Design an enzyme around this catalytic site. Structure first.
Site, short mmCIF file in Angstrom:
data_model
loop_
_atom_site.label_atom_id
_atom_site.label_comp_id
_atom_site.label_asym_id
_atom_site.label_seq_id
_atom_site.Cartn_x
_atom_site.Cartn_y
_atom_site.Cartn_z
N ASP B 141 0.77 -1.24 0.00
CA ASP B 141 0.00 0.00 0.00
C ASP B 141 0.81 1.30 0.00
OD1 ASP B 141 -1.96 1.88 0.04
OD2 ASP B 141 -2.86 1.28 1.95
N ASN B 146 0.91 7.39 3.17
CA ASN B 146 1.44 6.40 4.08
C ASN B 146 2.91 6.64 4.43
OD1 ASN B 146 -0.89 4.96 4.76
ND2 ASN B 146 -0.73 3.62 3.01
N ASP B 159 2.40 1.92 7.98
CA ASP B 159 1.25 1.11 7.64
C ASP B 159 1.60 -0.22 7.00
OD1 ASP B 159 -1.41 2.09 8.35
OD2 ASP B 159 -0.79 3.87 7.29
C1 LIG Z 1 -5.92 18.41 10.73
N1 LIG Z 1 -4.71 17.60 10.93
C2 LIG Z 1 -5.10 16.36 11.56
C3 LIG Z 1 -3.93 15.41 11.46
N2 LIG Z 1 -2.67 16.02 11.88
C4 LIG Z 1 -1.64 15.17 12.24
C5 LIG Z 1 -1.88 13.81 12.23
C6 LIG Z 1 -0.90 12.91 12.56
C7 LIG Z 1 0.34 13.37 12.91
N3 LIG Z 1 1.29 12.54 13.23
C8 LIG Z 1 1.16 11.24 13.11
N4 LIG Z 1 1.92 10.49 13.89
C9 LIG Z 1 1.87 9.19 13.84
C10 LIG Z 1 1.00 8.59 12.97
N5 LIG Z 1 0.73 7.33 12.72
C11 LIG Z 1 -0.20 7.32 11.79
N6 LIG Z 1 -0.73 6.23 11.26
C12 LIG Z 1 -0.61 5.07 11.85
C13 LIG Z 1 -0.93 3.93 11.17
C14 LIG Z 1 -0.81 2.70 11.78
C15 LIG Z 1 -0.36 2.62 13.08
C16 LIG Z 1 -0.03 3.77 13.77
C17 LIG Z 1 -0.16 5.00 13.14
N7 LIG Z 1 -0.51 8.55 11.46
C18 LIG Z 1 -1.51 8.89 10.44
C19 LIG Z 1 -0.85 9.49 9.22
C20 LIG Z 1 -1.91 9.76 8.16
C21 LIG Z 1 -3.06 10.60 8.68
C22 LIG Z 1 -3.62 10.01 9.96
C23 LIG Z 1 -2.52 9.86 10.98
C24 LIG Z 1 0.21 9.38 12.17
N8 LIG Z 1 0.30 10.70 12.25
C25 LIG Z 1 0.58 14.73 12.92
C26 LIG Z 1 -0.40 15.63 12.58
C27 LIG Z 1 -2.46 17.47 11.83
C28 LIG Z 1 -3.78 18.23 11.84
#
Ligand SMILES: CN1CCN(c2ccc(Nc3ncc4nc(Nc5ccccc5)n(C5CCCCC5)c4n3)cc2)CC1
Ligand SMILES: CN1CCN(c2ccc(Nc3ncc4nc(Nc5ccccc5)n(C5CCCCC5)c4n3)cc2)CC1
Lengths: 301, 309
Positions: B141, B146, B159
């Site tokens: 993916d 990602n 991911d």
């Molecule tokens: C309006 N926006 C909302 C989103 N935002 C933000 C979101 C996440 C982070 N950082 C961060 N850190 C770790 C992450 N681990 C996964 N994903 C993830 C996947 C599987 C296991 C653990 C984490 N993510 C995802 C990345 C894609 C968008 C959703 C958060 C992660 N994202 C910093 C800022 C800023 C303000």
């Protein structure tokens, strides 16, 4: 190396809450905003108490560079400085806070392995300063920080030079003549170790500071801690010898404490110690990924 | 192994609390969460992804073996799975990155992004994928979405293994990032990961442009079958576009291998201006040693970047 110290404008950071204070100044949890970026990044900020006998700005910076140059896993490194009307120092923020507070909080619930390991780590940190011909001048439990329960770092190096006096942690020669040396640091190290063993008891409680030089000349010393075997107390006693060259070197201390770490139960007799937990590999790996990525402990066997 | 057992932390619901949703995805919903260590007063920020129920499900032991594999990865550019809670919903715990995903970042900073950053990001992503290929693992993916930003200088793939663990119904699927063999026959290989890398590079160069916008997901196999491809980005030189083109070749074995990419993109980074054309590029340059030192102390204590000759 100037690359090590970063000078910051006031606009690029904010103070959001007070974490504590010292003879030196006030410490704030702060947020750093990289310019042109949307993140806010937590930091610890010390705003210096204002400057009786103010020193030239160039001198402050030169001290800051030295401070910026400290590179050891057990000594906190000064990261940034903002100087205006006021001097503000920026360093990494540690969620656990200071070691003195941490031992009090977990007062009888801390395992012998944690305690001996902390003694090793501080000694390793001090040894690093000695290698570099640097004298901390203010080692104490309040000036040790917990990165993780398994990792601690000395903080506040250079501050005493930068700007009441902590008589109860001081070496007799320093109290009398304001002499500061690695050996005087060794004296403070012993007091710091005494703080840990007593779970954050105040040293010489109920005795005023003015009396302290007098008690020392008499031969009075802090009492054997309840959990401490004679083997541990003796190291403390040595740290407080009047003839400074008689006190142990920091290098020797790492070895003694390390040896003890191997058989903690023989060295420290703590109630429920068997019950108490010393950190698993699974637990240790979790801690590292979340909090302590940096390069860096003795276990029973 | 024992080493494997150590890497994944079993978590009780008592241990953690979800506080805020950071976003949503085909796989599930992601929260900024706080870890509380037993017997402690601190709360540690962490990223929890709470899994959408798997297409036809597997036993927890099955779920666990796969989780151990995810906890296994140990590379600078690949996110490692720190912990899992399986009590009811499946929840995955990982390190939280303040900067967020790379796709949003490029979109946010499209005016301000230099050639040095872009090429380096490609090198880093290729490096991470090459590591997965060495581990005999297929991400399945890859997309800009990602990839997470630890700091602007350092990026990480995320991911990994979710697709396999989760499954997908034949009847949300990243069709436009997929290799043709994957779309038609659901064949997934490192070589198919390579195709996705090509799309991911495209996402970056265009600064977050959607791939194949205005073409239905359904139409995609046909347009590809006809030799239709993503257009060359305005910034990109032909040498870069051709590499993207190689990634989308119909014959999988003809496609580049990740180690090859690392080398080529790495070479390009040495002379960034030659390979991409960006107005104001000299203004946009890598962080100075002082800034780099600060950044690493605050956010990036782990584990280079290739700088211009
Ligand atoms: C309006 N926006 C909302 C989103 N935002 C933000 C979101 C996440 C982070 N950082 C961060 N850190 C770790 C992450 N681990 C996964 N994903 C993830 C996947 C599987 C296991 C653990 C984490 N993510 C995802 C990345 C894609 C968008 C959703 C958060 C992660 N994202 C910093 C800022 C800023 C303000
Ligand atoms: C009721 N409690 C009070 C304690 N608390 C807490 C305190 C500190 C931290 N972390 C942290 N991190 C870095 C520090 N760097 C200096 N000190 C310092 C020295 C020079 C320059 C910058 C910071 N400090 C001082 C250490 C002594 C006590 C006040 C905070 C620091 N403290 C986390 C939690 C949580 C609420």
């Amino acid at each position: 190396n100037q690359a090590l110290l970063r000078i910051l404008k006031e606009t690029e950071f904010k103070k959001i809450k007070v974490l504590g204070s010292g003879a030196f100044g006030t410490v704030y949890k702060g947020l750093w905003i990289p310019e042109g970026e949307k993140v806010k990044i937590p930091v610890a900020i010390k705003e210096l108490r204002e400057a009786t006998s103010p020193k030239a700005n160039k001198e402050i910076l030169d001290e800051a560079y030295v401070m910026a140059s400290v590179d050891n896993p057990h000594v906190c490194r000064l990261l940034g400085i903002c100087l205006t009307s006021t001097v503000q120092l920026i360093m990494q923020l540690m969620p656990f806070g200071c070691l003195l507070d941490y031992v009090r909080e977990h007062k009888d619930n801390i395992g012998s392995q944690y305690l001996l390991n902390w003694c090793v780590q501080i000694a390793k940190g001090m040894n690093y300063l000695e290698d570099r011909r640097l004298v901390h001048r203010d080692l104490a439990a309040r000036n040790v920080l917990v990165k993780t329960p398994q990792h601690v770092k000395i903080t506040d190096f250079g501050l005493a030079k930068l700007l009441k006096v902590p008589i109860k942690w001081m070496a007799l020669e320093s109290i009398l003549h304001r002499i500061y040396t690695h050996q005087s640091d060794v004296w403070s190290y012993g007091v710091t170790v005494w703080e840990l063993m007593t779970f954050g008891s105040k040293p010489y409680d109920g005795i005023p500071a003015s009396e302290i030089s007098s008690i020392l000349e008499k031969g009075e010393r802090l009492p054997q801690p309840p959990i401490c075997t004679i083997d541990v107390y003796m190291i403390m006693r040595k740290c407080w010898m009047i003839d400074a060259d008689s006190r142990p070197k920091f290098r020797e201390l790492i070895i003694e404490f390390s040896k003890m770490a191997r058989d903690p139960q023989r060295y420290l007799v703590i109630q429920g110690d068997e019950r108490m937990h010393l950190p698993s590999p699974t637990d240790s790996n979790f801690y590292r990924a979340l909090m302590d990525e940096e390069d860096m402990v003795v276990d029973a066997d």
